Amino acid sequence: PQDLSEALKEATKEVHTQAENAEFMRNFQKGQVTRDGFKLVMASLYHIYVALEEEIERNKESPVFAPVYFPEELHRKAALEQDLAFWYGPRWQEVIPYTPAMQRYVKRLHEVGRTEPELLVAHAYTRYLGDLSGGQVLKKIAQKALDLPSSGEGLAFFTFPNIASATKFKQLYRSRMNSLEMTPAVRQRVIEEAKTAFLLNIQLFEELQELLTHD
Numbered sequence: 001p002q003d004l005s006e007a008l009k010e011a012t013k014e015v016h017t018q019a020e021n022a023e024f025m026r027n028f029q030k031g032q033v034t035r036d037g038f039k040l041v042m043a044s045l046y047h048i049y050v051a052l053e054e055e056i057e058r059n060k061e062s063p064v065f066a067p068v069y070f071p072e073e074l075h076r077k078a079a080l081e082q083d084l085a086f087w088y089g090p091r092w093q094e095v096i097p098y099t100p101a102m103q104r105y106v107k108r109l110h111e112v113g114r115t116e117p118e119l120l121v122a123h124a125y126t127r128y129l130g131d132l133s134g135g136q137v138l139k140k141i142a143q144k145a146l147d148l149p150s151s152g153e154g155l156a157f158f159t160f161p162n163i164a165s166a167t168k169f170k171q172l173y174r175s176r177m178n179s180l181e182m183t184p185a186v187r188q189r190v191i192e193e194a195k196t197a198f199l200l201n202i203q204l205f206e207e208l209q210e211l212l213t214h215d
């Protein structure tokens with residue numbers, strides 16, 4: 001439907017559902033997550049955001065991405081750095097895993113950011129706004145299921161400090177994205193890449209599940 005944000009939601013409803021029904025995520029959402037599994041998602045998110053934010057910076061001035069460029073409100077890399085230092089210790093950077101499923105997610109981000117910046121919006125929208133909207137619920141599940149100490153660290157990723165109202169921010173983001181000048185042909189590629197984003201998360205979930213069950 002007219003608005004890109006609406007068309008995107010309709011065409012990805014199927015894969016979005018498959019993403020949430022993916023075993024690993026399904027369990028996490030049901031409160032079934034382990035420290036090992038949670039550490040894997042956090043490490044995964046770090047690699048994803050590092051690559052995504054790297055590509056955003058390279059394209060922040062392009063007419064195709066500038067409208068959805070909100071560095072202070074959304075950057076997550078720094079937050080994940082604080083979090084990984086807690087979950088993996090002081091030497092996290094040389095200990096966190098970087099699996100094949102994480103690698104191809106990163107690869108795709110770099111591909112899009114370097115040659116087709118017009119599609120970066122598909123990843124940024126689903127990743128940022130998706131994480132922003134589901135964070136508080138996932139955070140509580142994490143706290144309950146993992147029983148961490150009153151360390152004051154480990155879940156910074158789940159709080160977007162520079163966004164007062166998640167609802168008002170999403171309204172603004174969709175507005176910028178919905179008023180983005182794009183061809184019905186370019187528009188189709190973007191919707192298709194939104195699909196790619198969800199599919200990349202599904203293959204990641206499938207791998208993390210496999211890793212945990214066979215270690």
